[PDB]
Symmetry: D2
Subunit: 257 residues, 4 copies
Amino acid sequence: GFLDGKRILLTGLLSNRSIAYGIAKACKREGAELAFTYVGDRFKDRITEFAAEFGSELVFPCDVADDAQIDALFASLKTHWDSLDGLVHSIGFAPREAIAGDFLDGLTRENFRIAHDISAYSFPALAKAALPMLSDDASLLTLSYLGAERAIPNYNTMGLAKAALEASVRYLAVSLGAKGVRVNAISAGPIKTLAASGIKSFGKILDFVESNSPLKRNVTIEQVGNAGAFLLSDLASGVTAEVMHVDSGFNAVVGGM
Amino acid sequence: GFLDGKRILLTGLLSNRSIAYGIAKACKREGAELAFTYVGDRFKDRITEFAAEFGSELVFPCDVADDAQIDALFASLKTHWDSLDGLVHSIGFAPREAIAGDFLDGLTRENFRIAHDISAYSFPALAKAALPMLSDDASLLTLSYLGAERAIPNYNTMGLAKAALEASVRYLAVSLGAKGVRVNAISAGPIKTLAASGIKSFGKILDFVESNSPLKRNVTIEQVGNAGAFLLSDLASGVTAEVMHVDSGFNAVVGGM
Amino acid sequence: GFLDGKRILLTGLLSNRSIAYGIAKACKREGAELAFTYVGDRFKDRITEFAAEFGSELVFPCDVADDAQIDALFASLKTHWDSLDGLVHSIGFAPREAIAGDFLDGLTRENFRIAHDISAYSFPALAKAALPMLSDDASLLTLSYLGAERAIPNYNTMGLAKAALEASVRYLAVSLGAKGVRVNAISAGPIKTLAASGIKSFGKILDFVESNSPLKRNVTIEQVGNAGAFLLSDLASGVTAEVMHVDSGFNAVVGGM
Amino acid sequence: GFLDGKRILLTGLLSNRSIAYGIAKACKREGAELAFTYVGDRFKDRITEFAAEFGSELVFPCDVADDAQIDALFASLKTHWDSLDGLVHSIGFAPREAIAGDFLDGLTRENFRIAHDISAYSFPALAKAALPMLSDDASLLTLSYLGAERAIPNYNTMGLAKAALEASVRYLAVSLGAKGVRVNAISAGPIKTLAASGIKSFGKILDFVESNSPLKRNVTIEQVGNAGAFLLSDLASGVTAEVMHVDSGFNAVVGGM
Ligand SMILES: NC(=O)c1ccc[n+]([C@@H]2O[C@H](COP(=O)([O-])OP(=O)(O)OC[C@H]3O[C@@H](n4cnc5c(N)ncnc54)[C@H](O)[C@@H]3O)[C@@H](O)[C@H]2O)c1
Ligand SMILES: NC(=O)c1ccc[n+]([C@@H]2O[C@H](COP(=O)([O-])OP(=O)(O)OC[C@H]3O[C@@H](n4cnc5c(N)ncnc54)[C@H](O)[C@@H]3O)[C@@H](O)[C@H]2O)c1
Ligand SMILES: NC(=O)c1ccc[n+]([C@@H]2O[C@H](COP(=O)([O-])OP(=O)(O)OC[C@H]3O[C@@H](n4cnc5c(N)ncnc54)[C@H](O)[C@@H]3O)[C@@H](O)[C@H]2O)c1
Ligand SMILES: NC(=O)c1ccc[n+]([C@@H]2O[C@H](COP(=O)([O-])OP(=O)(O)OC[C@H]3O[C@@H](n4cnc5c(N)ncnc54)[C@H](O)[C@@H]3O)[C@@H](O)[C@H]2O)c1
Ligand SMILES: CCCc1ccc(Oc2ccccc2)c(O)c1
Ligand SMILES: CCCc1ccc(Oc2ccccc2)c(O)c1
Ligand SMILES: CCCc1ccc(Oc2ccccc2)c(O)c1
Ligand SMILES: CCCc1ccc(Oc2ccccc2)c(O)c1
């Protein structure tokens, strides 16, 4: 398939409901060879299974909060893979206050810092840290959300991280485009994942979108998985710096009238 | 491949440099079954060859300026294909004055009318005219340009057609999304085609883009072809109402500084 | 005030609820000198009153559908005013089918043509037709709507006109910016006017916006009037090609969740 | 004038070339009553003059890096002013590496943190910290740049801060819009200020924009000053969550072809 022989490092695979999960399936299904990351020694076992399920024996710890691990990650990886062809950044986090209720009520220098550190900075951070072993046709891909461009209830500080993340996509594309590397983001629709547990009335949004999206249905990690494989592949060799909505077209309407 | 067994009607195939040409290759290459259109009886012979080259024997006249032919087109087609799975609208035109030099100098109620009739109206026109035989996973795809969103020298009235075209994409996605139909547009970078002959200093733009695009190179009909196949395919089953830039990332920078 | 001595031609003044009405008040209130247009001989009397109410004795017929009247308009005007300092385009229209119910159900080559002729073409049409007597600090201003950028129920074909109109703003700004002329558009929120009678469930939208706008209220022609004066004024001497939302911030949220 | 009797706190006034300077002039000129901030005890003297020049005797230290001073600021201010009617955030900063040369070359967890802390977080930070004494017609205004939406050479990490800042504008508008408070940003064109010294080839950009802007000229702090007075005033009572370009229309074109 269109990923035959491509070596892709996937982050953010946590459950079988993870967006990163559907992207692994879609990649494996297209010939890709995969490697994975996890956070903390207490997940080391779960990711090892998941990796086995995709014929991979490569699992690496990486707390994107630690310069040390990010650097360790690519040193380790280097001994197994000669070069890297794809990196998937499926990483987000915000203190629980910062994504609950009133925007200003959850705001503090600390929450802001953390949400931006982990959800925004980490993406170009990993990029700089892969630059060395990246290939010439290589493709980076990150996940984002409509909340970066429009005020969504409860999203709050996540909204700002995501705006910064999407700006980094553009600055990455320019920085790495010289070397033939492409950088893109997918803007996904609401999908019930672990991370999604912290968005109160997530159920309200999900229902709303199913009512008003042009396609009148919710998206799935397979749909998102499928678009990602594309962007990671050479079919998308003319596509860099894009932010691609995959949300049954929801961004495009004004719903509920 | 990801288009196995899909039946796709392609318009705007004129030369072997046409965008519609690269999209046919990409589709055929992915298992698609193709049908084509042409304008005027004096091209009837050329399109028949082209169709042969993609294992097709289906060629149909269609001047999108004529309600008659647009209707004839889908009546004819109906006797061969039971249903339609994909339609590609690769059609643009503007009187030569309207895309030369000063915007206001080429402006006249007549030019405006024509450019909008042919380049914009025709897309949803064809859609209404296919609605009857369209399938449930069907996908519509049109071509557009960055000049719809930013003032490009010489583009002029084409700029306005293209803004209207892109708006129709959204209204189409809503109208047809109920029936499971997806509608999308690709925003292509500068490609030396016959239509591109009418843009003076097209050579200036093309050179500029090659200098300043993040990927530092120009796009090709194969790159555009490849993205189109994707959008026409069920890989993009979560993607509707999108306008997808395929231009080495050019929209995303500010060049020449 | 900030319009002292500026001579401004206003179109689209039909009732005392018209957007063009609130812009006249705001302009007069700021020292402006006004002139007005009307359509058909059977409104000649109403506009004459309205003009009196703003200390003006200048009323001119102009069916923007007729090259003749558009030209007559500025010939006439020229004998009274030596030069023009501001033009307000407050003109929209679409056959009733084209803004009712299903998008595709109201679509016909004829409706499309008409809505685009009157709502879109007319703006740059008038501009070319004023170019001769326009001054160096002159400012053009048109009205638009959020339906140009996102699919709104019932808006339909008006959506496409408005996208083309907004593109013309950019091409105008480039064309006339050389001569010091500025061109801008205001994107207004829902306001109960005569034109708004043709949007079924306009009452539904208006209520929705009042519920979900960040400011939690609907806009008024005075609010729109006030922004327009600004754009027409030399306060906005650094502002061209802008599309300025004036809608209690509605474009910026995702409502109803 | 349109700011008669309004009490506005201005930050970021550093030189007579400051953007905040032109906004003070424009505000004073329209009837406003002003108060100012400064950073560090070694500027205490300069701001005191500047404040005298606008008939103000209110100057307050505020390192937006310190929770302490931000809180002190509004406690102090409270004893002089009963309530606040306008706040201007004219604050930006990034380590010199982060805005020099290659994006990835200037990237470090620390630079990112700092640029986001000072340029992005500080705006809603100040807002929460003013909420108590803010009035019902109150208006917040921040400064931003086109680099938030498109990759500009050298801007780099500033690009991301600015994207986050502009997202905060939307989330602010929603949070404070309930209480009648409006929140807006101005996207300014290149202006030779102290902060602008750190952008290498700033002179290249400034020249480029003067060549290609629709108005064919650069903007000035008076032009920006004038737009800001507007947004701070009740003329803009229908305008919240907007990001208003003031850049001779530069965002709207594609230059250099
Ligand atoms: N759920 C949705 O609807 C949705 C929509 C759009 C985007 N997203 C985005 O997609 C991404 C994935 O979220 P998800 O929905 O698949 O939920 P998920 O929980 O399955 O994925 C989140 C991942 O973030 C990882 N992560 C958190 N902190 C980390 C750290 N300090 N270092 C490294 N990794 C860390 C978690 O381990 C987890 O694997 C996120 O970036 C999120 O913003 C989710
Ligand atoms: N080269 C560029 O960078 C570029 C970018 C974006 C979109 N396009 C678009 O793609 C399409 C074609 O591009 P192209 O470069 O191959 O131009 P092309 O001239 O080489 O081919 C386009 C085809 O549209 C045809 N056409 C004209 N009138 C028609 C009608 N009434 N009915 C059906 N077809 C008609 C033309 O004759 C031509 O065959 C157009 O829609 C154009 O707007 C070109
Ligand atoms: N209410 C809304 O929310 C809203 C929002 C944005 C823009 N508008 C726009 O502002 C303008 C008018 O709004 P309105 O609410 O006052 O509608 P209105 O009907 O109350 O007044 C608009 C005027 O345009 C006039 N017009 C029609 N054909 C004309 C022609 N050939 N030449 C000159 N004028 C003509 C109408 O007759 C009417 O007098 C239109 O451009 C419309 O698109 C309305
Ligand atoms: N120069 C331009 O072309 C331009 C264009 C668009 C936006 N801007 C933006 O406008 C704002 C003002 O910049 P400027 O161009 O007027 O230059 P400026 O130097 O005159 O203003 C910058 C201000 O930021 C202040 N500041 C820096 N660190 C601070 C801190 N730790 N705490 C509080 N205040 C601090 C400085 O004291 C200074 O007063 C910035 O936010 C900038 O991003 C500048
Ligand atoms: C609103 C649903 C969309 C969405 C859901 C979950 C998301 O994942 C999060 C959310 C907050 C913090 C960390 C990760 C997300 O980015 C986007
Ligand atoms: C730089 C030229 C970009 C471009 C070239 C050809 C294009 O196709 C045309 C051109 C003119 C009229 C109608 C359709 C186009 O849309 C855009
Ligand atoms: C919710 C309605 C918004 C709206 C109302 C009236 C408007 O003015 C019209 C309406 C229909 C046709 C032509 C011009 C408008 O543009 C937008
Ligand atoms: C490129 C010119 C536009 C611009 C110039 C100076 C600016 O001010 C800065 C820049 C970097 C760090 C801190 C403040 C700015 O935001 C935007």
